[PDB]
From a paper:
Flavin-dependent halogenases (FDHs) regioselectively halogenate aromatic substrates using halide ions, O2, and reduced flavin (FADH2) at physiological temperatures in aqueous solution, making them a green alternative to conventional synthetic methods for aryl halide preparation. To better understand mechanistic details that limit FDH catalytic efficiency and potentially hinder their application as in vitro biocatalysts, we investigated the halogenation activity, substrate scope, crystal structures, and ligand binding of the Trp-5-halogenase [name] and the Trp-6-halogenase [name]. HOCl generation occurs >10 Å away from where the Trp (or other aromatic substrate) binds, and the HOCl must diffuse through a tunnel toward a conserved Lys,29 which either hydrogen bonds with HOCl and positions the Cl for reaction with Trp by EAS25,30,31 or reacts with HOCl to form a chloramine, which in turn transfers Cl to Trp by EAS. Our results show that flavin cosubstrate/coproduct (FADH2/FAD) and substrate (Trp) cannot bind simultaneously to either [name] or [name].
Apo-[name] crystallized in P21 with four molecules in the ASU. There are four [name] chains in the asymmetric unit, arranged as two dimers (B/D and A/C) with the same dimer interface seen in the [name]/FAD structure but different crystal packing between the dimers. The monoclinic crystal used to solve the apo-[name] structure had been soaked in Trp, but there was no electron density in the Trp binding site. The most significant backbone difference between the chains in the apo-[name] structure and the [name]/FAD structure is in the flavin binding loop, which is closed over FAD in both chains of the complex structure but is disordered in Chains A and B and in the open conformation in chains C and D in the apo-[name] structure. In addition, the Gly10-Gly11 peptide bond is flipped, so that in apo-[name] the Gly10 carbonyl O is hydrogen bonded to the NH of Gly14, and in [name]/FAD, the Gly11 N–H is engaged in a water-mediated interaction with the FAD pyrophosphoryl group (a similar flip was previously observed between the open and closed conformations of Thal31). In the apo-[name] structure, all four chains are missing the η3-β9 segment, chains A, C, and D are missing the segment between β16 and β17, and chains C and D are missing five additional residues at the C-terminus. The four apo-[name] chains have Cα rmsd values ranging from 0.33–0.51 Å with one another and from 0.78–1.11 Å with chain B of the [name]/FAD structure. In apo-[name], even though the flavin binding loop is open/disordered and Glu46 points inward, the gate is closed, and the lid is open. The closed gate explains our inability to soak Trp into this crystal form, but it is unclear why the gate remains closed even though the flavin binding loop is open.
Numbering used by the authors: 0 to 36, 43 to 144, 162 to 261, 266 to 514
The structure:
């Protein structure tokens, strides 16, 4: 009753995360074939579980992939010029039923909520490793992630999967053939014949050769709510070893800084209706400085949105073929991992229960729609309205339900029951952090706090300061930690 063969079309992170995960889940019990013809990438909290599922320890794969830790995103110039705050991978401290951020909002202890309420922002400022020299994490309350070279990770996972039995075909796909039912029959390669199988995984990127082209599945654009449709990127050496991604708001988008161990990936995500590619490139080069003078710039047109369905007949799209949003909250690898994890969970047998597709498609659509709402909030709640781009960010049509949630958030800070009510990766603490940092909404603390005992909250504020000072004195820098791993 089980399927016998999976064909993954396309390599990169999408294809080789799929192939490697299938071998960890199913072993030799099903055949996997991948057909395929450095970029710094950031990740989201759940990626720790992907490597754990494959049995890979950080000390094994991080050195081979130029990887560093990502404890937070540093948001620069979204509220006002010269202002920054951290969005940390750090879950809430709750005191007598109220988050510490609620207590802070009632009586702010400084200009920086992220300094008073969190530990991780200070760790980023001090270039800290999250692991001590003794190998232990400093602490989960800290669901951190990584920066890595996506090409090196793809090669690492390729070696992992091929060593465990994945068949690797190096060739171009010239055509996709459908049978009389409209299911994928086979893929025509340039010089290796036609590859057939039970299940086809479309990892062909924006081109979406199987799902979007051969099967002609409609694609739902997000461009009306999120206008950024383009990017220009370059790479420079490390001078920068800060354990966070930086997102610096610009006149028509934002610039990412993604620190690898000895390289920095940087790029300008922008809206082509507001600025030209050559002006985006000029801005990016000036931002990076003299190190970018001779670096080669890569220009990218983005397909922003999601497929209407992600599993159609015997085809499942994974990666940019399934959907994409700008990497403002580093969701690319997250979308891939969610798609693979849910594919294993909803894996079909030879009877191809249509209910599996229905559930799978709803889960993916809810993840992507929920992330879309979260990103819209980034531009809506950003206080800056200095030009037409940042004014328009407040007048675009909002996704269903968001207008009501925005009103709830200006009564009490976001919690589990006032955010997008389906799984979409991000937890309520991320909403609270972004709203406080972006500064554009009229937020209010809970009136009940004026009747509560303040001693527990005041104790917690003092503890955060004492712990941040202890960690500043004890933790090594990322460089010091990685130098110790190299010596070991």
């Amino acid at each position: 009753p089980m399927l016998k063969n999976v064909v993954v079309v396309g390599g990169g992170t999408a294809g080789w995360m799929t192939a490697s995960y299938l071998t960890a889940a199913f072993g030799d019990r099903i055949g996997v074939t991948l057909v395929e013809s450095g970029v710094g990438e950031a990740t989201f909290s759940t990626v720790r579980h992907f490597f754990e599922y494959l049995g890979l320890e950080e000390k094994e794969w991080m050195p081979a992939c130029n990887a560093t830790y990502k404890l937070a995103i540093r948001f620069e110039n979204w509220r006002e010029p010269g202002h920054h705050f951290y969005h940390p991978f750090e879950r809430q401290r709750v005191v007598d039923g109220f988050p510490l951020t609620d207590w802070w909002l009632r009586e702010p202890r400084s200009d920086r909520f992220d300094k008073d309420c969190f530990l991780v922002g200070t760790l980023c400022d001090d270039l800290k490793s999250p692991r001590q020299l003794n190998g232990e994490l400093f602490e989960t309350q800290f669901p951190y992630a990584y920066h890595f070279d996506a090409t090196l990770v793809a090669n690492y996972l390729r070696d992992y999967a091929v060593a465990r039995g994945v068949k690797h075909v190096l060739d171009d796909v010239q055509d996709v053939a459908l049978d009389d039912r409209g299911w994928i029959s086979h893929v025509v390669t340039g010089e290796s014949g036609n590859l057939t199988g039970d299940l086809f995984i479309d990892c062909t990127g924006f081109r979406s050769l199987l799902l979007g082209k051969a099967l002609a599945e409609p694609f739902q654009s997000y461009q009306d709510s999120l206008p950024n449709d383009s990017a220009v990127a370059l790479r420079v050496p490390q001078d920068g070893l800060r354990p966070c991604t930086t997102a610096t708001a610009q006149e028509a988008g934002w610039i990412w800084t993604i620190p690898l161990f000895d390289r920095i990936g940087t790029g300008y995500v922008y809206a082509g209706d507001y600025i030209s590619p050559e002006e985006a490139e000029r801005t990016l080069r000036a931002f990076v400085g003299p190190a970018a003078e001779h670096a080669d710039a890569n220009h990218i047109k983005m397909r922003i949105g999601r497929s209407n369905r992600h599993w159609v007949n015997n085809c499942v799209a994974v990666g940019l073929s399934s959907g994409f949003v700008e990497p403002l909250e580093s969701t690319g690898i997250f979308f891939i991992q969610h798609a693979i994890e849910q594919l294993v969970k909803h894996f079909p047998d030879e009877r191809w229960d249509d209910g599996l597709r229905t559930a799978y498609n709803k889960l993916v659509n809810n993840v992507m729609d929920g992330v879309r709402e979260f990103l819209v909030v980034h531009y809506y709640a950003a206080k800056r309205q200095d030009n037409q781009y940042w004014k328009d960010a407040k007048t675009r049509p909002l996704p269903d339900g968001l207008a009501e949630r925005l009103e709830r958030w200006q009564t009490r800070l976001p919690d589990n029951e006032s955010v997008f009510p389906h799984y979409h990766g991000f937890e309520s603490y991320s909403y609270v952090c972004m709203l406080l940092g972006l500064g554009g909404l009229d937020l209010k603390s809970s009136p009940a706090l004026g009747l509560m005992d303040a001693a527990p909250a005041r104790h917690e504020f003092k503890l955060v300061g004492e712990q941040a000072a202890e960690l500043a004195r004890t933790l090594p820098t990322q460089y010091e930690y990685f130098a110790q791993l190299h010596r070991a």
